[PDB]
Structures are given as C-alpha cells and as structure tokens.
C-alpha cells in the first residue's frame, strides 16, 4: 500500500466481468483490494494428463526435427507451461478441443484453451487460479440458447434441469481473461447479433446480462448507470456499513 505508483491500482480493461469496477476500498488500498463479480468463478484446478493424452492422440509430435520452421507447423501446443510439441493443423485442433469441452470427456468446463493466430501458439491452461465467467455461445449469428432450454430451466424444480445441464448441452461456456482476449462478445443478442449495419458478423459469444459485471455491494445500487462513478464506490463502502 505504501507505493504511490498509480499503475497497479487503475481499473484494467481485463477486469471486465470478473472484478467489480465500483467496489474498491478507498485510502491506501484504492484499486489494490478488489471484489469478484457476481457471475465470476475461480478455477479449482485439474490434472493436465488427459489433455496431454488427447493431444498426443490427435497429433502434436514432440521431439521433432526443427519442424517449427518459421512456424510452418502452425501453432505450438502449450499446457500449463510446458511446450508439449506442435501441430500442423491448428484450427481443426481448436475445434476438436471445443467439441470435447462440450462432451466433457477430457476437458472440464474450467479448462482454458487459447490460440494466438498470430505468433502461432495454443496455451491450454488448467492451473487452479484462473478467474473465468460464463458466457453464452453464438454460432453463426444465432445464440445456441433456445426456447427448449429456457422452458426446461423455468420448470427447474421437479424437472431435474439445472445450470450444469445447460453447460453440458454446450449452450454456455466458461471463459477466462486469456480467452476473453480471443473472443468476440455481444452485450445483448437482439441488439447485436441481429442483422443491421454490420459492425461484426463473427460474434462467438454473448453476455448473459451486462449487470453481472458488478459485485455484491454494487449490485444493490439502483440505476447505477445514472450515477457518477466515484459515487458507486462510495455506496459500496457505505453498504458494507449499513445496519440490518
């Protein structure tokens, strides 16, 4: 807290959807103590062995003969660190990995797979510390979430349908900050996915609701978008002090 540098304290863009922008302590700890967003989840950790076995089965020749070769072998498959080889086809590997994430065979919902098309690296991180959030999946310009899923969830009790079934169906997906860097998001389905003057026609995900970017204390603020930003921080601090 003693350090007066105003770099580590500022609200970074990558905090979107994973740390509350409004809720921070004021004083020596501005921007140094943060609070999770409402929908944020933190990875618990998993063994990387099944992912490595799948990669070995698909291709990912390790101990190759200087095959990168100006990255002719597109992408270098990384895991939690540990360059484990490279593949000639990166897009097929990425699509197969996403399908496996849906079928929940080798990839748990938390396993994060990032391909950097330029620089040609795939990172595949499962390291127990990543903070991720659920996002709906957009195929073409259509959300995968449909009336069947919503009707089943509406009957949630005595229908034995829950959020985990929504994840298993492949409707929703957990995305961490690294994957948030490689994903085109839409705030709302109707306003953005629908055909208009085409800003983007390659949306890959959709926010479940924007208001989830706020934390627990900032979520009680009514009409927070109509207030000045410091006032929402003040209300977070004061709502921690209310009597009830």
């Amino acid at each position: 807290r003693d350090g007066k540098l105003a770099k580590p304290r500022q609200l970074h863009n990558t905090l979107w959807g994973m740390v509350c922008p409004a809720e921070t302590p004021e004083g020596h700890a501005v921007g140094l103590v943060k609070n999770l967003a409402l929908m944020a989840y933190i990875s618990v950790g998993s063994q990387p062995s099944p992912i490595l076995e799948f990669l070995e089965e698909w291709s990912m020749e390790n101990l190759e003969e200087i095959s990168p070769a100006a990255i002719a072998d597109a992408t270098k498959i990384f895991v939690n660190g540990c360059w484990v080889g490279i593949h000639k086809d990166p897009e097929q590997l990425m699509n197969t990995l996403r399908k496996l994430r849906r079928q929940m065979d080798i990839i748990v919902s938390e396993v994060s797979m990032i391909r950097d098309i330029r620089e040609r690296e795939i990172r595949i991180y499962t390291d127990a510390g990543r903070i991720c959030r659920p996002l709906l999946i957009v195929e073409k310009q259509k959300l995968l979430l449909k009336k069947r899923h919503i009707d089943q969830l509406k009957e949630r009790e005595y229908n034995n349908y829950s959020w985990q079934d929504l994840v298993a169906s492949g409707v929703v997906e957990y995305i961490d900050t690294l994957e948030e860097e490689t994903v085109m998001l839409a705030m709302t389905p109707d306003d953005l996915q629908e055909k208009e003057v085409a800003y983007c026609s390659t949306y890959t995900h959709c926010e479940i609701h924007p208001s989830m970017i706020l934390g627990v204390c900032a979520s009680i603020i009514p009409f927070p978008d109509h207030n000045q930003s410091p006032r929402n921080t003040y209300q977070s601090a004061m709502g921690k002090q209310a009597m009830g």
Binding site: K4, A6, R9, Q10, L11, N13, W16, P21, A22, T24, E26, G27, H28, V30, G31, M187, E207, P210, I213, F223, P224, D225, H226, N227, Q228, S229, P230, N232, T233
Partner: protein, 48 residues
C-alpha cells in the same frame, strides 16, 4: 465509442461499455486523490 467516449448523459444512463470506461476514469481520480495526500503532506512538513 470504442475508445471511451460516452455520448449518453447521466439522466439518459450509460451503456455497459460506457459504464466500464466511466468507472476507469473515476478510479483514476480516486487514485490521484489517495496518492496526493502523502506527497503533499511530506512537502508541507519539509517547508515548515
């Protein structure tokens, strides 16, 4: 819009991206205040 301009007024209500960018600006102001206090205090003590 991409780089932070907020066209909506407070009465109209900020859109979500405008809300996040406004939060970034307010955070910068708060950090400035908190960092300012100590440096100015040291200067004042030295002068006196």
């Amino acid at each position: 819009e991409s780089r932070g301009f907020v066209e909506n007024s407070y009465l109209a209500g900020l859109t979500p991206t405008e809300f996040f960018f406004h939060a970034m600006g307010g955070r910068e102001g708060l950090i400035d205040t908190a960092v300012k206090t100590a440096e100015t205090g040291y200067i004042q003590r030295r002068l006196i």
